[PDB]
Design goal:
monomer, 341 residues, alpha+beta, Phosphorylase Kinase, domain 1, Transferase(Phosphotransferase), domain 1, 2 domains, 5-stranded antiparallel beta sheet, two-stranded antiparallel ribbon, 11 helices, 9 strands, 33% helix, 15% strand, binds ligand PGJ, ATP-binding, NFAT protein binding, EC 2.7.11.24, ATP binding
């Protein structure tokens, strides 16, 4: 089989999709793409359709299309965005130049669902548990999110949450960023995603952004004032002289009393936060560890927290030319096989 398409301009952009999907309605766009809500007539479902902006405009563009198609094809978890479909109108490699991605429309992000804010301990518990559950899977594939933030979480009105790996507004990235990755570090880790999860949690229990820096310099100042200036041990792990100084040069920040800052809320929540917002990535709790913690007693089930199949990202090392990335991508478009009902 090979479907028939129809073009239209969802302002000011042109869309070329199988007749399968109807009622294409714009829902947002960034620099790397445009999404539309729509109805999958096959399954009778509502879906999100993403048209990538110019997938192969450059080497940098080429490899990221590829990166995106590859991760999305790999992700099969209820807490992580995956692919229902992927298509192109082209009929040969020769004319390949557009890529479309299909997934379950969620219709909003955490932000979009949460404001004005401060929800019951109960919803926080549930939202964060879904995030730690999807993160468990992703990390288990040897993948680091690194861009975890509210606008990177897709939530529907049933409060079900999915992590999207690529996807801002319509959040301010450095507000959610592990300190280590605002210092040029490192041979750092997975637990940078744990920092952000802590940052999101704080704001949900609190109704306000934990660390709304104005820049990377400010950002660190606010982080330090909560968590305090670094132990001499941590210090010794820092090779970056300039990093050491910036730190070593501050008010000697005392570690603040979580209890007092946070907030009148569930002492379990706070003791978990305590464990997520650590200066040392080496000492930060892990997705899986975080899931087995008292705070999520009513949601936590160890035999329903799957981990992923291994993912080859050896491609990340390579340096190919646009055409090779492009044909790589196409090959993956060609080979895609759809999910089961
Ligand atoms: C436009 C804001 O976010 C878009 N988001 O980034 C993406 O990149 C995709 C995306 C779409 C298709 C795909 F195959 C993969 C990702 C979606 C996406 C995925 C699923 N549902 C929705 O619905 C939303 C609508 C408005 C606001 C937030 C939403 O979550 N978006």
């Amino acid at each position: 089989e090979r479907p028939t398409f129809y073009r239209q301009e969802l302002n000011k952009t042109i869309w070329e999709v199988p007749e399968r999907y109807q009622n294409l309605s714009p829902v947002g766009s960034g620099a790397y793409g445009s999404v539309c809500a729509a109805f999958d007539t096959k399954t009778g479902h509502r879906v999100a359709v993403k048209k990538l902006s110019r997938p192969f405009q450059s080497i940098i563009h080429a490899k990221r299309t590829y990166r995106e198609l590859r991760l999305l094809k790999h992700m099969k978890h209820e807490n992580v965005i995956g692919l229902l479909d992927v298509f192109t109108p082209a009929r040969s490699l020769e004319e390949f130049n557009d890529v479309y991605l299909v997934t379950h429309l969620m219709g909003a992000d955490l932000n979009n669902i949460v404001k004005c804010q401060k929800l019951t301990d109960d919803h926080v518990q549930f939202l964060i548990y879904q995030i730690l559950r999807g993160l468990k899977y992703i990390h288990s594939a040897d993948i680091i999110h690194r861009d975890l933030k509210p606008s990177n979480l897709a939530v529907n009105e049933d409060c079900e949450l999915k992590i999207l790996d690529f996807g801002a507004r319509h959040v301010a990235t450095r507000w959610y960023r592990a300190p280590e990755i605002m210092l040029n570090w490192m041979h750092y880790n997975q637990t940078v995603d744990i920092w952000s999860v802590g940052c999101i949690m704080a704001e949900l229990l609190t109704g306000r952004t934990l660390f709304p820096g104005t820049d990377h310099i400010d950002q660190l100042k606010l982080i330090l004032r909560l968590v305090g200036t670094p132990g001499a041990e941590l210090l010794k792990k820092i090779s970056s002289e300039s990093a050491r100084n910036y730190i070593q040069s501050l008010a000697q920040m005392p570690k603040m009393n979580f209890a007092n800052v946070f907030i009148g809320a569930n002492p379990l929540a706070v003791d978990l936060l305590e464990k997520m917002l650590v200066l040392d990535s080496d000492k930060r709790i892990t997705a899986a560890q975080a899931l087995a913690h008292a705070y999520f007693a009513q949601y936590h089930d160890p035999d329903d927290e799957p981990v992923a199949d291994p993912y080859d990202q050896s491609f990340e090392s390579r340096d190919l030319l646009i055409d090779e990335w492009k044909s790589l991508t196409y090959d993956e478009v060609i080979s895609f096989v759809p999910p089961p009902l």
